[PDB]
Write a protein that binds this ligand. Structure first.
Ligand SMILES: CCC1=C(C)/C(=C/C2=NC(=C\c3[nH]c(/C=C4\NC(=O)[C@H](C)[C@H]4CC)c(C)c3CCC(=O)O)/C(CCC(=O)O)=C2C)NC1=O
Ligand SMILES: CCC1=C(C)/C(=C/C2=NC(=C\c3[nH]c(/C=C4\NC(=O)[C@H](C)[C@H]4CC)c(C)c3CCC(=O)O)/C(CCC(=O)O)=C2C)NC1=O
Lengths: 147, 146
């Protein structure tokens, strides 16, 4: 964050670098777009989740938890997008591969997640900038289940 | 702020509400303007600092330390502006007036700080919002010195 960047600059007795400034400038300026994205994923959260669950419907034994988890995945994506901090996804998906490996099916989860991503993207057809943001964050989520 | 309202929604296992989204909208917009300001001040810092030194050059007995401090002051102003937190200035200015009244002239430092302000402001004559933002942070710098 800003307070982060400032702390290290201070630590090194210096002005923020041109790069640090540009990076913060871009973080603030993409803010409106990131909020637009979150508002949209949120209001459509239920349709996005049910599309993902449906795609693996026949693989699911625990539908209540499946629907819950898929909603939670999308909710943390949504946090990360609002904060402009992909690490929110990383911290909160820590260890989930093992847990869901064991709980149901790793294969299926990735299938559902890919549908979370596709269904999410579907709301930004006209808006390449947003689609990129959405794909970047969704890819961070999925990758935490791949390698 | 980013982490704060997200932390709450997180604790309550929910999506951010529309009211939360609008509040962040205001945060990011202001941050954008603050960052534009900080970039200008940073890129033109040598110029700003030299104007301020030059404005009191007759009183300066140590050009080096004077140029250093004025830069140090400007630096902390930019930190405050970037974070949007005037208290960065307050905290790092604490007790400084005494150290510097000793070292040279408290009063010349004030004149030079007014020139830091006046010089900083010259980059924002087309943008009265940004100008007011620079004036408000610089005033905290000058005041907490006095
Ligand atoms: C990133 C945010 C986040 C997620 C997603 C999360 C998931 C998560 N899923 C869990 C269990 C589970 N998850 C599922 C199933 C599924 N899960 C899926 O994402 C699939 C759609 C489906 C497998 C097909 C099942 C069947 C269990 C354990 C069932 C139980 O004993 O109740 C558990 C173990 C504790 C619990 O049962 O609640 C966690 C922590 N925790 C988090 O903080
Ligand atoms: C907000 C960030 C910040 C500032 C500004 C700061 C100033 C500061 N100026 C100092 C000294 C000094 N400062 C100056 C001069 C001046 N100082 C001025 O701001 C005037 C423009 C000019 C007098 C006209 C002089 C001559 C010394 C004594 C250093 C020496 O004797 O070599 C000292 C004493 C220790 C040192 O020499 O490093 C500090 C701590 N410290 C900080 O953490």
């Amino acid at each position: 964050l800003a307070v982060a960047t400032i702390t290290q600059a201070e630590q090194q007795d210096r002005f923020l670098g041109r790069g640090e400034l540009d990076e913060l400038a871009s973080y603030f300026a993409s803010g409106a777009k990131r909020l637009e994205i979150a508002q949209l994923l949120t209001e459509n959260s239920e349709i996005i989740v049910s599309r993902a669950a449906n795609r693996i419907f026949q693989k699911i034994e625990n539908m209540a938890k499946s629907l819950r988890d898929l909603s939670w995945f999308l909710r943390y994506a949504t946090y990360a997008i609002v904060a402009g901090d992909p690490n929110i996804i990383v911290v909160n998906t820590r260890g989930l591969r093992e847990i869901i490996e064991n709980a149901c099916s790793g294969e299926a989860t990735i299938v559902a997640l890919q549908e979370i991503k596709a269904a999410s993207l579907s709301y930004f057809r006209k808006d390449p900038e947003a689609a990129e943001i959405v794909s970047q964050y969704m890819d961070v989520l999925i990758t935490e289940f791949k390698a």
